[PDB]
């Protein structure tokens, strides 16, 4: 099972190692309730790690490559959104290098 595997590393990113990483990324944004038109319209696809959990819970994601493809997405965005220098993009690149990693063990 891969599904069990990548479960494995949500957990990690949730204990505590990546947990700095992992609260910044965890809340979605409300566009809606905060205001940020431009947000809507420049990416239009909000992701979030908290609907990543909700996928996971409801075996949305019957595969890792589905699962994969929601997280380079999520990253992309920010890096579209805002330019890298400051911290909130420097977070995400110290997550994408370790996801890589795991990545290369990940197939089975």
């Known amino acids: 099972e891969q599904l069990k595997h990548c479960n ?6 949730l204990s505590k190692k990546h947990a700095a ?15 940020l038109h431009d947000y809507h319209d420049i990416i239009k696809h909000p992701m979030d790690l908290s609907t ?19 997280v380079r997405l999520m990253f992309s965005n920010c890096y579209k959104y805002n330019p890298p220098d400051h911290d909130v993009v420097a977070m995400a690149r110290k997550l994408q290098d370790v996801f890589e990693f795991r990545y290369a063990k990940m197939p089975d």
């Open 21 to 35: 990483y992992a609260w910044p990324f965890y809340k979605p944004v409300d566009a809606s309730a905060l205001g």
């Open 52 to 70: 990543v959990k909700r996928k996971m819970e409801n075996r949305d994601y019957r595969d890792a490559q589905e699962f994969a493809a929601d």
């Open 8 to 13: 494995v590393i949500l957990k990690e990113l």
